[PDB]
Amino acid sequence: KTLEVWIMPNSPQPAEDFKALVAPFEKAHGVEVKVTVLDWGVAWTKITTAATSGVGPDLTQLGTTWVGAISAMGVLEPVDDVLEALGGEKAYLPAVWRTTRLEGARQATAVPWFSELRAFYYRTDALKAAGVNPAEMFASWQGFEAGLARLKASSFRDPETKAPLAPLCTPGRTPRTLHNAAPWIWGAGGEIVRQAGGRWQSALNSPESLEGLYFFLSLAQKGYVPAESLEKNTAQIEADFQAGKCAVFASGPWMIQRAQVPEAKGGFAERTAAKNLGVAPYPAGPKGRYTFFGGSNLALFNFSKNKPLAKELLKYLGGPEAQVRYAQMTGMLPALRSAWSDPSFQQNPLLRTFIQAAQFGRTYPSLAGWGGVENLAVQHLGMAWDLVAQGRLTREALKDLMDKASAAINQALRHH
Numbered sequence: 001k002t003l004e005v006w007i008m009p010n011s012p013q014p015a016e017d018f019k020a021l022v023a024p025f026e027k028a029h030g031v032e033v034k035v036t037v038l039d040w041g042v043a044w045t046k047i048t049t050a051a052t053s054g055v056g057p058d059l060t061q062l063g064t065t066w067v068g069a070i071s072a073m074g075v076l077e078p079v080d081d082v083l084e085a086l087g088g089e090k091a092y093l094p095a096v097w098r099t100t101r102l103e104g105a106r107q108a109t110a111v112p113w114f115s116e117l118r119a120f121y122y123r124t125d126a127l128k129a130a131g132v133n134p135a136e137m138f139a140s141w142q143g144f145e146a147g148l149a150r151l152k153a154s155s156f157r158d159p160e161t162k163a164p165l166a167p168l169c170t171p172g173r174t175p176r177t178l179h180n181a182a183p184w185i186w187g188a189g190g191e192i193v194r195q196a197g198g199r200w201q202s203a204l205n206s207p208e209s210l211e212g213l214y215f216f217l218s219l220a221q222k223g224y225v226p227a228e229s230l231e232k233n234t235a236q237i238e239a240d241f242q243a244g245k246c247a248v249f250a251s252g253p254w255m256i257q258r259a260q261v262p263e264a265k266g267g268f269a270e271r272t273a274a275k276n277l278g279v280a281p282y283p284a285g286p287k288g289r290y291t292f293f294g295g296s297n298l299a300l301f302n303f304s305k306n307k308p309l310a311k312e313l314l315k316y317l318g319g320p321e322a323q324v325r326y327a328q329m330t331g332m333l334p335a336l337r338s339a340w341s342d343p344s345f346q347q348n349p350l351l352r353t354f355i356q357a358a359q360f361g362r363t364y365p366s367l368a369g370w371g372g373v374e375n376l377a378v379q380h381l382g383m384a385w386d387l388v389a390q391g392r393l394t395r396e397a398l399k400d401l402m403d404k405a406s407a408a409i410n411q412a413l414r415h416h
């Protein structure tokens with residue numbers, strides 16, 4: 001009677017890392033845990049097929065934004081008991097607690113596993129050369145844009161590339177998520193959706209959502225993001241920062257680990273970027289400072305024949321030791337807030353800065369139809385990036401694109 005867990009590729013050797021993570025559990029319970037790794041490309045279909053058919057694992061990883069949809073299909077075992085065992089609501093950042101259930105539900109259907117959050121990496125050497133104070137640049141929108149202007153004008157050249165750096169790298173081609181836009185929307189006082197007028201509705205066409213989205217998108221149109229960045233994807237921009245092409249770029253905590261180890265093990269300790277690496281939280285907008293939170297949770301299918309032992313494994317994976325260990329393996333932040341005290345975070349100044357950024361964490365409402373909302377939002381955000389690529393984004397053009405986004409989202413939110 002052996003547990004079956006489904007995971008996605010969260011670490012360099014996903015199945016073996018997971019098996020090393022649960023070795024102490026296996027010993028204590030006299031059990032083997034079986035793991036299957038699902039590519040992110042097919043994980044959603046595999047998990048919805050398990051949901052509809054009843055053919056699946058005991059435990060599955062879920063992206064945080066998936067919890068509403070799978071919970072609303074009726075297939076997840078309540079895990080309030082597990083979360084209470086881990087410390088209950090105060091054991092988590094509120095944005096992370098929000099991901100434990102369908103929005104508005106009283107019963108928890110998912111256990112927080114690990115957190116993606118995003119902050120700005122910068123080249124300490126580039127900002128020093130351009131006369132930019134990092135505290136000022138990453139404090140506010142005005143500091144941020146003034147910084148990028150100084151970096152655009154800087155005579156500084158990367159030691160290894162012998163070329164100027166792009167002030168900001170951000171991808172403009174084929175956006176799959178709102179995660180790079182959301183902090184700007186939120187900082188302006190906006191949101192992606194809201195409860196207004198008795199309904200969930202798009203808030204992308206609100207003046208405040210448009211202010212934040214225009215502020216961000218216009219940086220690229222002012223020459224702070226080179227056309228070559230605009231043209232690209234998400235591991236390219238990490239490769240670009242590593243390769244000394246970008247002064248500033250947003251990423252998660254995994255780049256810190258990578259900066260600390262040589263090319264041998266898949267790091268960039270050798271590159272000028274590793275030796276001149278800073279991190280700062282997103283700047284405050286006019287209506288607040290917000291950090292995007294994502295990541296993954298664990299869930300138990302209620303058709304499992306080993307729910308008792310599966311709940312023990314959720315307690316283990318969700319708990320302090322496994323939280324610290326799996327954060328190291330994945331390069332993510334623990335979902336269990338107590339684990340942030342661990343020396344592995346507190347002895348690394350760049351990881352302490354991520355924990356500073358964590359205090360401002362926010363995430364999307366846990367809606368059953370969240371995926372439809374985000375798919376329509378990203379499609380229209382990509383239309384906006386396309387106007388940037390032509391230098392044709394105006395405030396009126398962005399407003400028109402988000403009014404079309406909002407009609408489509410509102411229609412999708414009226415259907416289940």
Ligand SMILES: O=S([O-])[O-]
Pocket residue numbers: 406407408410411
């Ligand atoms: O329903 S609203 O998009 O007119």
Ligand SMILES: O=S([O-])[O-]
Pocket residue numbers: 411414415
């Ligand atoms: O616009 S109707 O399809 O909800």
Ligand SMILES: [Cl-]
Pocket residue numbers: 094095098361362363364
């Ligand atoms: Cl939140």
Ligand SMILES: [Cl-]
Pocket residue numbers: 171175178180181381
């Ligand atoms: Cl974006």
Ligand SMILES: [Cl-]
Pocket residue numbers: 191192193363364365
């Ligand atoms: Cl939102």
Ligand SMILES: [Cl-]
Pocket residue numbers: 393394395396
């Ligand atoms: Cl304009």
